[PDB]
Amino acid sequence: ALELGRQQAQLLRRSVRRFSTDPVPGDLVEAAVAEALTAPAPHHTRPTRFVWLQTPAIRARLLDRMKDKWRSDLTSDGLPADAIERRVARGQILYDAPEVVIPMLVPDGAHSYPDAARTDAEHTMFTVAVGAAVQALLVALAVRGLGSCWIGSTIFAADLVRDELDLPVDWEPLGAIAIGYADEPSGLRDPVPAADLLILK
Amino acid sequence: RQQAQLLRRSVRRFSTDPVPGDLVEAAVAEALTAPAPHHTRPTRFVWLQTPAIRARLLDRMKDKWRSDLTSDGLPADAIERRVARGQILYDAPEVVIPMLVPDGAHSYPDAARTDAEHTMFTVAVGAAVQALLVALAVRGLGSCWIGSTIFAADLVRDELDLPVDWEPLGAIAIGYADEPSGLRDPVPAADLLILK
Ligand SMILES: Cc1cc2nc3c(=O)[nH]c(=O)nc-3n(C[C@H](O)[C@H](O)[C@H](O)COP(=O)(O)O)c2cc1C
Ligand SMILES: Cc1cc2nc3c(=O)[nH]c(=O)nc-3n(C[C@H](O)[C@H](O)[C@H](O)COP(=O)(O)O)c2cc1C
Incomplete structure (x- = not known):
């Protein structure tokens, strides 16, 4: 059971888009976030902060301002009204979701360099570290029976x-x-072989 | 299940036991279960099997380091101490390089949304890396992420x-870890979890 339990974890993780209305224990969020932060990070750094959007008027107003920027940016692009609203409808999940947590990069412990190349490299390194912390959260949630879906939208609205x-x-x-909690039970994913995504040299 | 992610430690000393290749393969299959933006495949893992090529790539990295850190004005002392921290990639039984590839990247005319897309693909690869280190660990195999190739991409x-x-x-x-480690027992998030 201990062997198996070890083997199962990351295969419970799906991108869940339809949630039941069962409230989420605060404690599972907090514990899952604590587990997430076992992800690796460069030494003497703390790249990741998780920003849990508990106040619904705050969540809501951030999402409306995002929606607004989306429509005006997609309109500049010359997309037709219907197509813009299709895109915008993709954001509806963040409105209805029982909880929402924004992962953020912060350059805590970042090394400082004079040149642009190593400064960008450093920020990249920090970026992949936050990426690792997010996977570890999705998995920590999934092992505590909780679904989740990563939505990339805030990446396109950092100033807002x-x-x-x-x-x-x-x-x-x-x-x-x-x-x-996912609205539909989901089994274990059975992952496929790596095939062309693994390159041998 | 509570176990899996807690087996993952950054390990810096490996035994001489060889690593069965099917575990590296199976573990990469599991890593690629990490999420990825729709119709994208941001991640490639590049396994350095050919020892001459590994030795040759690290050697050029070592030279670039020495030459750079000397530009910065570090003492030979401190330089040798820092570059010796890259010995692990020479000694490790296997070395896999994760790589971002803009496969299925959406196209934008402006730099702002272009960078955003690049940042989006960058975090997806990070998630896949975590998924790898765990996948390895849960098959009883240690690993360590070393950032150096990010600083020598052209090389x-x-x-x-x-x-x-x-x-x-x-x-x-x-x-395989030279010394076994206890499970992690994570500390609460405290100030790294911000409530709004
Ligand atoms: C992006 C990134 C780069 C890293 N680069 C190095 C490195 O160059 N040398 C090294 O010994 N460890 C490196 N590490 C491992 C960290 O040092 C390690 O995660 C940290 O010391 C905490 O250890 P833990 O992973 O055992 O929790 C890196 C980790 C990350 C995420
Ligand atoms: C950086 C990033 C951004 C994402 N943004 C979105 C999004 O805006 N909308 C969405 O439905 N899914 C998003 N996803 C989830 C993927 O669409 C999902 O992983 C994919 O549909 C299938 O993988 P899964 O079901 O195995 O996770 C994102 C994933 C990542 C890594």
Whole structure:
């Protein structure tokens, strides 16, 4: 059971888009976030912050301001009205989701370099670390019976997130995580072989 | 299940036991279960099996480091101490390089949304890396993520004959831990979890 339990974890993780209306224990969120932070991070750094959007008027106003920017940006692009609203409808999950947690990059412990190349490299390294912390959260949720779906939208509206949530300039949003009990039971995924995604040299 | 992610430690000393290849393969299949934006495949894992190529790529990385850190004005002392921290990639039984590839990237005319898309693909690869280190661990195999290839991307592309838009996102040293470790027991998030 201990062997198996070890083997099962990451295969319970699906991108869940339809949530039942069962409230989420606060404690599972908190514990799952604690597990998430076992992900690796460069030494003497803390790249990841998780920003849990508990106040519904705050969640809501951030999402409306995002929606608004989306329509005007997609309109500049010359997309037709219907197509814009199709896209915008993709964001409805963040409105209805039982919980929402924004992962953010912060350059805590970042090394400082004089040149642009190594400064970008450093920010990249920090970016993949937050990426690792997000996977570890989705899996921590999934093993506590909780579904989730990573929505990348805040990445395209960093200034609006920062302004709305009153965060300093160097906090960088890396999406949004919708969290809830899935409306439909889902089994274990049976992953496929790596095939062309693994390259031998 | 409570176990899996807690077996994952950054391990820096491996035994001489060889690593069965089918575990590296199966573990990469599991890593790619990580989420990815729709109709994209941001991640490639590049396994350095050919020892001459590994030795040759690290050697050029070592040279680039020495030459750079000397530009910065570090003392020979401190330089040798820092570069010796890359010995692990020489010694590790296996080395896998995760790489970002813009496969299925949506196209934008402006730099702002272009960068956002690149950032989106970058975090997806990170998630896949975590998924790998866990997948390995749950098959009783240690690993360590080393960031260095991110700082020598041109060298890595040159040396591995990869195209210009393959971006290395470190290197994962893999082997059986020389000393076993206890499970992790994570501390609560405290100030890293912000409530709004
Ligand atoms: C992006 C990234 C780069 C890293 N680069 C290095 C490295 O160059 N050398 C090294 O020894 N460890 C490296 N690590 C491993 C971290 O040092 C390690 O995660 C940290 O010391 C905490 O250990 P833990 O993973 O055992 O929780 C890296 C981790 C990440 C996420
Ligand atoms: C960086 C990132 C951004 C994402 N953004 C979205 C999104 O805006 N909408 C969405 O439905 N799913 C999003 N996803 C989830 C993927 O669509 C999902 O992983 C894919 O449908 C199938 O994988 P899964 O069901 O195995 O997770 C995102 C994933 C990542 C890594």
